[PDB]
Amino acid sequence: MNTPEHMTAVVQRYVAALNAGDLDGIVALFADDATVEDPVGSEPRSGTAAIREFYANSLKLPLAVELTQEVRAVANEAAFAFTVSFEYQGRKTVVAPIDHFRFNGAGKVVSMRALFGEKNIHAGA
Template identity: 40%
Template sequence: MTDSEKELVIAQQYSDVADSYLRYLNEKNLEGILSLYAENATVEDPVGSDVITGKVELRKFYSKAVNMDLVLTRTGQVRVAGVEIAFPFQLRMNVDGVPMVTDIIDVFRFDEAGKIVSMRAFWGPFNHKPANE
């Protein structure tokens, strides 16, 4: 296998992780989500908030997410650069009875085993609006 063929295989594996991540969140599959992460991974969601480190803390964080009524949909291609990916998606959920949509870009960095070592979610108040707008 040539180097460029290897890069394509790895890029596809990373893209598959992004899709699995969104699918597991939609399915409320906590163990599936955690299986994507390395043992000492970090999550910063949104960027600028406190960084969560390690599987114990990630379990607490994602336990809340899987108990919410969320719908996540990828809205563009996964971009792969080296050992990192970025991908856009929308989060739809009700907030105080109002259907809301948030446009988010997640950035994952991977280790040699293909596990996520860092997840950073880029979104803020300007990306959050009523779903009917």
């Protein structure tokens, strides 16, 4: 029923790839017809095309994600929480959204939805 090592490992490899800016790879990370939602209720994308479109418009910003908690892998599920370092307009900020990925088939992510709150961000300079 999906392992935490494989799942979590995927999340890890994904994070790295993310910081690497590997869109193609990141895309290959999950299904090809999967649906990503970042942040939330902000028009979810579907298909390596969309997934890439978003992930791209996202990376568009020079940020650095890093784990500061852990991952919540369960029934073909993997809901982990990570931080996002980004600074703009002489204003630094660090978010801590939660990525919720659901694997299907056996270990293929076809659905990905994040969870970011207002108090999940910490501005500063």
